[PDB]
């Protein structure tokens, strides 16, 4: 399908389906545009810019406005809007209108889905033995793999090879990494559908713009889950985006103080989006000024500006508790917009599937 869907000018985020896009509009031209999108029940576009300086984009996501909050204050009618990505797309044309707003000619990319790798081998063999409920975890996984991938020996590959491409096994492998960071159950918080699960992981992973662009370019949910695991296992280090050799934090230090994932979308009083990742420790960061509690995203904890040790670029903030009864006593809220996941040693970015 094809649709000429409008584009907001102030948006600089790379939106993933399912991910929320917070907004705070001061200009009345884009406020009126937002309100028209409510009545006509149309979706706007979020262009994933490769070169954001000269506004160049090849892919994106159709965001639908799901929340609007007009706050008529003494100064100006300030609005707060939350939107949600729905369908991925390819950019065909950028029709810049006389009002300074562009109407992108969009081609909706199809959500590619694939059946179980064992079902493509045979039709009726091992059908009765396939899905099982719920003794220990090791004994359940050893027999689950041997009973589900019993057809694998009929092909030119082993049982363990197909486990690297099974959606259920890939989802569980990710869940084991996520549970180390967050102490939340999958039961209702994380979805069971591989498509929704892959996009949920993509949104909460601390990754740079180019990784999100290549992750959005992926069509199959199976490939997306595999690429996400490659980032988690290979990129066990987050560095400064400006100087690309300044180690700030590692994978083993990621945790969730807020019970809403490790990296949530927060906004400052000036209408700017900060995807803050919570980590216990964060080396090579200079603290600027005194510890403040004004508009504190983590109440009780005091924030202090944390800039890079070499290039002094804004990376995040140090959060320390005021009361001794709090647990933990200290953590760092690092913004995604300034972190580069670096593979340690001396190898550059690579990721099978």
């Amino acid at each position: 399908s094809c649709q000429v869907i409008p584009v907001l000018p102030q948006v600089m985020m790379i939106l993933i389906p399912g991910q929320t896009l917070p907004l705070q509009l001061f200009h009345p031209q884009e406020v009126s545009m937002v309100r028209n999108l409510i009545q006509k029940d149309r979706t706007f576009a979020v262009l994933a810019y490769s070169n954001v300086q000269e506004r160049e984009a090849q892919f994106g996501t159709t965001a639908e406005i799901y929340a609007y909050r007009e706050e008529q204050d003494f100064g100006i009618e300030i609005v707060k809007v939350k939107a949600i990505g729905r369908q991925r797309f390819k950019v065909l044309e950028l029709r810049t209108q006389s009002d300074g707003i562009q109407q992108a000619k969009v081609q909706i990319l199809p959500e590619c889905v694939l059946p179980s790798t064992m079902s493509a081998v045979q039709l009726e063999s091992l059908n009765k033995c396939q899905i099982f409920p719920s003794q220990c975890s090791y004994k359940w996984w050893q027999k689950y793999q041997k009973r589900k991938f019993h057809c694998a020996n009929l092909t030119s590959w082993p049982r363990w090879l197909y486990s690297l491409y099974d959606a259920e096994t890939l989802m569980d492998r990710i869940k084991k990494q996520l549970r180390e960071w967050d102490e939340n159950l999958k039961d209702d918080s994380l979805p069971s559908n591989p498509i929704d699960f892959s996009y949920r992981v993509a949104a909460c992973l601390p990754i740079d713009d180019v990784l999100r662009i290549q992750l959005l370019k992926i069509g199959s949910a199976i490939q997306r889950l595999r690429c996400e695991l490659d980032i988690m296992n290979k990129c066990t280090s987050l560095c400064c985006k400006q100087c690309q050799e300044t180690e700030i934090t590692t994978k083993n230090e990621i945790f969730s103080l807020s019970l809403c994932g490790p990296m949530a979308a927060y906004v400052n009083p000036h209408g700017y989006v900060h995807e803050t990742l919570t980590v216990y420790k964060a080396c090579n960061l200079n603290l600027i000024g005194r510890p403040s509690t004004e508009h504190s995203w983590f109440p009780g904890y005091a924030w202090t500006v944390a800039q890079c040790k070499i290039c002094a670029s804004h990376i995040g903030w140090k959060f320390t508790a005021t009361k001794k009864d709090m647990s933990p006593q200290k953590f760092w809220g690092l913004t995604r917009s300034a972190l580069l996941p670096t593979i340690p040693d001396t190898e550059d970015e690579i990721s099978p599937d």
């Binding site: 199809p110 590619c112 889905v113 694939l114 059946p115 179980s116 790798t117 079902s119 493509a120 081998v121 045979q122 039709l123 009726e124 063999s125 091992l126 059908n127 009765k128 033995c129 396939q130 899905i131 099982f132 409920p133 719920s134 090791y138 004994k139 050893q142 041997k146 009973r147 019993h150 020996n153 009929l154 092909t155 030119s156 590959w157 082993p158 363990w160 090879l161 197909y162 486990s163 690297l164 491409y165 096994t169 492998r173 069509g219 199959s220 199976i222 490939q223 296992n233 690579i350 990721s351 099978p352 599937d353």
Partner: protein, 1119 residues
């Protein structure tokens, strides 16, 4: 592109078997579903009589028999993978058999997610409805009535989504369905009533009940017991509302039960099969309650014995059980009252060959005979095997007497008391030599009353204990016991005999145009008929058939001018059917013969053409004209039985045995360069042998099994994985993996002895390249440990010479045999991977170079790699390998070591590796085709093109530097062309629904080769061997028209059009078939009747029917 694809060996794996009365109400039948084929048999005391075999245009997903109201015999319901429902009726009108379609229709939904437990189709006992479960939460019902021809069915919204198994419950007021389903709480059994009027699920007979966490089988128990049986891993329960009987026997915990079948109609006994290949008896004991109805006393399980790993079982009769296997050979077993010493009531009777799963294969000219052979890694677990497949029928030559210029052969018996043959009379130019057979001795002797200065046309044993000899001078009769000439018929004008033929009781000779019918009686040969013909005689035959078994009432003949085959009555010479033949070539030979039941008239010509027509023994008229060329020199037709069936040997440039299978004539070649004349022989020294004769040598030898393709099986009793050949050492390298249980003593013990344990020489991969502290070995007792291995199996005897075992947790994934660098030694290189259960991704692996010398596999090099080695190939004297997502090229140094020459890191796993010259086609399990190239001046790889479409992929091959064949999701084949401007992407130029899962592609052919470009064989999971050969566009354009024209005339089973069946299908994408020609459809042009060919061939180049016969016949020679 333009590629042609034909089936070299039909699928052998069995995926469904039923018993009923499909052919006749009295005949007990056995129906077998060999994927895209249906076999029909009759249960007899000997075994199974084959009746019909038909080609279904779809993978048979469900197969069931049923007989509704107003039906004399069972009707067969079949549903295919593309959801094509059909009700087929068997109708035999005389000696002709036909499968007609009573009702047909496609039951595919507009939008539907296929269920995890495949397609489940079941029929109601009273034949009131068909309950299908194609998609999750949707149960479709077809109304079974004598009116629904198009099969319009209704879909019902089922709240239960994850249904494991479902069967229509026997003994009910309304059509009830019993099923076991899974939900987040647990596995439970539920029942519903299916109303056709309302189209909804009303409450069933009994409440929902809980079942075992590993319960996955439902059995519809028939009257008088009723209810259902639920089989699980440890427990077996019974459900009849009030009663809930359950047993947990220890004899069933060793393996998961996977199949079942009923023995008694009432349901007192049931046969169950498991994954380890065991056979069990489930006995429903019956208590005698005095109120007429009976109650279940207790369930009893007993182990009968060991059988092949059965996908489906079926009880035939008198303890005879058919075992339909997917992994191993399907077999026919007998259950005895008394068990053998080992304690097994199961005794095998017959074994049916199954080549699948063909996990790997290679083409090797083993006997250097010019014709290639195919050795395949077949089977899995105890069913592990290696099969050697070759085209043609072999001839095991024993004698070789040099006698050039033999013009006829005949077996004789000088002594009457002996049943065996002791004389072999040979004819020569103007002379006749006689040979004696005292065991293996052959001496030139003289038989009394047999003239030797005349050329003989026929001689042999005849009625009243006498001997006959038809010579150019006259017909002679010799009394067998006193050895003397007793009667001699001579031509009145002393003319020579031109053509003659004689049988057990009659003698028919001809002199130019004259003909004389004579009869064999004690010491006399009396002339009865005297008839003149239109033109001179070309050939004659008087072979009697099963009309009366004595004297033949009909006679066959041919003419010189106005060539035609004619039939004559013996006491008169009435012209019954004068089939006129075309061409300026006379018929050299003619023969009347029986095949299974139907009689045929075979007529051969000087140009090598052969005509065959059905002939009725009473009327004497011909039917179904079918012409086929075998050789280019005149053909000689003689009969021989060999293994309890009449067969015809056609001596010509391409000698061939004309035999019958599936009530149609088959023409399989014999592996001999040329045979001029031959006859069957049965001497003491040469028992049940054949006497062949060519331009220079008389040869006596035993023929092979009369069938297309000769297959030799080598049992290993363990899973083979890869195979390669090493010509220098005259043996094969085969990766294998036996399964040893974890011992309580801290070791390993195999469940049965196999190729890797029982070897001449054995060695362990003693190496420390991997440290002990890597992953803690935490496997409890009874865990399935896969012990990988490399076998050095011989190429002549196929004996396991060596079995090198790898390290603990080591998995061998690739194997090649080649000379690397400037080293003259040929090595066996194996790529491995360290698989620890706790680790998900393989972070360790190695590459081992081996040298088989002094009967022991020595280790030359050992290169450790940080990843799994999935594939390796020889590349211009440098070893190319795949470590996780890295394509590395190694150089073999002068100090025998592998140094890293260059690396190419890709963003896709490297599973497939194929090369042609300096081109490298890499692939992934998710269809990521990537073409790389090694520039020698640069010294590293460079990407040329790629096409990353998300789809499952099983195999890949390079046809040429531009075309790249591959197998993809939902049993399809595709081709990728290179437009060498836009060059960095591969153009997909081929789409074809094969219907088989290809595990391996291999370049080569199984033809002698003393029309089409290239030759690629392929091995599938269902044991089907196919062939892909590329063809010109002009030839594709011609054959593409034939595909559309043949579909209009060929009566498809279930009325499924060829276009839809062979069209691409991956659920989301369903495009038509392009860049491919279904060779099996083209080959069926010869099977259709003669008037149908004129309709097909309707419209410089002129269409002519005969012209297209030669083109289709040329395409059959490639396989």
């Amino acid at each position: 592109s333009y590629n042609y694809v034909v089936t070299a060996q039909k699928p052998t794996a069995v995926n469904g078997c039923v018993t009923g009365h499909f052919t006749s109400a009295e005949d007990l039948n056995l129906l077998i579903a060999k994927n895209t084929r249906l076999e029909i048999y009759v249960v007899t005391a000997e075994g199974l009589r084959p009746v019909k075999e038909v080609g279904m245009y779809g993978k048979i997903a469900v197969m069931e028999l049923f007989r509704p109201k107003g039906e004399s015999k069972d009707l067969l319901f079949i549903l295919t993978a593309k959801y094509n429902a059909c009700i087929l009726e068997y109708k035999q009108s005389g000696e002709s058999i036909d499968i007609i379609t009573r009702a047909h229709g496609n039951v595919q939904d507009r939008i539907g997610r296929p269920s995890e437990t495949g397609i489940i189709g079941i029929i109601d006992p009273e034949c009131r409805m068909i309950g299908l479960r194609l998609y999750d939460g949707l149960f479709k019902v077809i109304p079974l009535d004598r009116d629904n021809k198009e099969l319009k069915a209704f879909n019902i919204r089922l709240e239960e989504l994850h249904v494991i198994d479902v069967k229509f419950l026997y003994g009910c007021q309304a059509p009830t369905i019993c099923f076991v389903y899974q939900d987040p709480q647990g596995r439970h059994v539920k029942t519903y009533e299916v109303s056709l009027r309302e189209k909804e699920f009303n409450k069933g007979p009994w409440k929902q009940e809980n079942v075992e966490a590993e319960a996955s089988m439902v059995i519809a128990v028939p009257e008088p017991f009723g209810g259902a049986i639920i089989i699980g891993q440890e427990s077996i329960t019974y459900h009849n509302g009030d009663k809930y009987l359950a047993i947990a026997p220890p004899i069933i915990k060793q393996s998961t039960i996977v199949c079942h079948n009923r023995v008694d109609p009432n349901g007192s006994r049931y046969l169950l099969g498991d994954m380890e290949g065991r056979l069990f008896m489930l006995l429903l004991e019956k208590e005698e309650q005095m109120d007429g109805t009976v109650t279940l006393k207790d369930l009893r399980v007993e182990l009968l014995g060991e059988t092949s790993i059965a996908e489906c079982l079926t009880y035939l009769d008198n303890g005879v059980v058919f075992v339909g296997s997917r992994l191993g050979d399907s077999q026919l077993v007998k259950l005895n009252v008394d068990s053998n010493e080992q304690g097994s009531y199961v005794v095998a009777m017959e074994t049916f060959t199954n080549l699948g799963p063909i996990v790997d294969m290679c083409v090797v000219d083993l006997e250097r005979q010019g014709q290639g052979q195919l050795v395949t890694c077949s089977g899995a677990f105890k069913e592990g095997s290696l099969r050697i497949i070759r085209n043609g029928i072999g001839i095991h030559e024993h004698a070789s007497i040099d006698l050039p210029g033999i013009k006829g052969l005949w077996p004789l018996r000088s002594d009457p008391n002996r049943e065996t043959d002791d004389t072999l009379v040979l004819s020569f130019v103007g002379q006749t030599r006689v040979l004696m057979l005292n065991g293996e001795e052959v001496e030139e002797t003289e038989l009394m009353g047999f003239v030797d200065d005349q050329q003989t046309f026929f001689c042999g044993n005849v009625a009243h204990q006498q001997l006959i000899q038809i010579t150019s001078a006259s017909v002679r009769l010799v009394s067998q016991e006193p050895k003397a000439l007793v009667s001699e018929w001579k031509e009145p004008q002393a003319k020579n005999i031109s053509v003659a033929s004689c049988n057990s009781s009659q003698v028919v000779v001809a002199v130019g145009r004259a003909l004389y019918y004579l009869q064999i009686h004690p010491q006399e040969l009396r002339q009865i008929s005297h008839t003149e013909m239109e033109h001179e005689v070309a050939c004659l035959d008087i072979t009697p058939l099963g009309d009366s078994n004595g004297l033949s009432p009909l006679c066959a003949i041919g003419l010189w001018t106005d060539i035609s085959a004619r039939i004559l009555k013996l006491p008169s010479f009435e012209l019954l059917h004068k089939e006129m033949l075309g061409g300026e070539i006379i018929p050299r030979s003619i023969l009347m013969t029986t095949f299974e039941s139907s009689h045929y008239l075979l007529c051969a010509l000087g140009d090598g053409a052969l005509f065959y027509f059905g002939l009725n023994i009473e009327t004497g008229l011909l039917s179904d004209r079918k012409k086929v060329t075998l050789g280019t020199q005149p053909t000689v037709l003689r009969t021989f039985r060999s293994l309890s069936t009449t067969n015809v040997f056609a001596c010509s440039d391409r000698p061939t045995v004309i035999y019958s299978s599936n009530h149609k004539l088959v023409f399989s070649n014999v592996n001999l360069k040329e045979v001029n004349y031959m006859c069957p022989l049965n001497s003491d020294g040469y028992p049940d042998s054949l006497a062949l004769a060519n331009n220079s040598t008389l040869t006596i030898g035993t023929i092979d099994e009369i069938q297309k393709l000769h297959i030799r099986t080598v049992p290993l009793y363990e899973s083979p994985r890869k195979i390669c050949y090493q010509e220098v050492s005259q043996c094969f390298g085969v990766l294998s993996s036996r399964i040893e249980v974890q011992d309580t003593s801290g070791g390993t013990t195999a469940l049965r002895p196999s190729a890797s344990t029982q070897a001449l020489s054995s060695s362990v991969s003693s190496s420390k390249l991997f440290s002990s502290s890597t992953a803690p070995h935490e496997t409890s007792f009874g865990e399935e440990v896969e012990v990988h291995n490399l076998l050095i199996i011989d190429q002549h005897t196929f004996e396991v010479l060596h079995a090198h075992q790898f390290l603990q947790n080591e998995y061998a994934l690739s194997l090649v045999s080649c000379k690397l660098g400037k080293d003259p030694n040929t090595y066996f290189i194996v790529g491995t991977a360290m698989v620890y259960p706790e680790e998900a991704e393989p972070k360790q692996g190695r590459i081992v170079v081996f040298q088989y010398s002094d009967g022991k596999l020595q280790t030359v090099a050992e290169k450790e790699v940080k990843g799994a080695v999935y594939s390796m190939v020889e590349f211009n004297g440098k070893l190319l390998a795949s470590i996780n997502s890295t394509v590395r090229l190694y150089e073999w140094t002068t100090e025998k070591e592998l140094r890293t020459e260059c690396n190419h890191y890709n963003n896709i796993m490297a599973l497939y590796l194929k090369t042609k010259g300096d081109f490298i086609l890499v692939g992934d399990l998710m269809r990521s085709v990537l073409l790389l190239a090694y520039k020698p001046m640069e010294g590293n790889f460079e990407e040329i093109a790629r096409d990353f479409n998300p789809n499952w992929m099983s195999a890949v091959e390079i046809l040429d530097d531009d075309n790249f064949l591959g197998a993809e999701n939902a049993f399809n084949l595709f081709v990728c062309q290179k437009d060498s401007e836009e060059r960095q992407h591969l153009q997909e130029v081929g789409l074809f629904h094969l219907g088989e899962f290809v595990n391996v592609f291999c370049h080569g052919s199984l033809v002698m080769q003393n029309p089409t470009q290239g030759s690629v064989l392929f091995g599938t999971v269902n044991g089907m061997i196919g062939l892909v050969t590329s063809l010109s566009e002009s030839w594709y354009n011609l054959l593409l028209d034939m595909q559309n024209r043949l579909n209009k005339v060929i009566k498809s089973v279930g009325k499924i059009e060829h276009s839809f069946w062979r069209s691409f299908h991956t659920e989301r994408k369903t495009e038509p078939a392009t860049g491919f020609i279904d060779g099996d459809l083209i080959e069926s042009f010869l099977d259709i009747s003669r008037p149908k060919m004129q309709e097909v061939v309707a419209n410089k180049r002129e269409a002519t029917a005969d012209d297209l016969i030669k083109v289709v016949e040329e395409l059959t020679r490639i396989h």
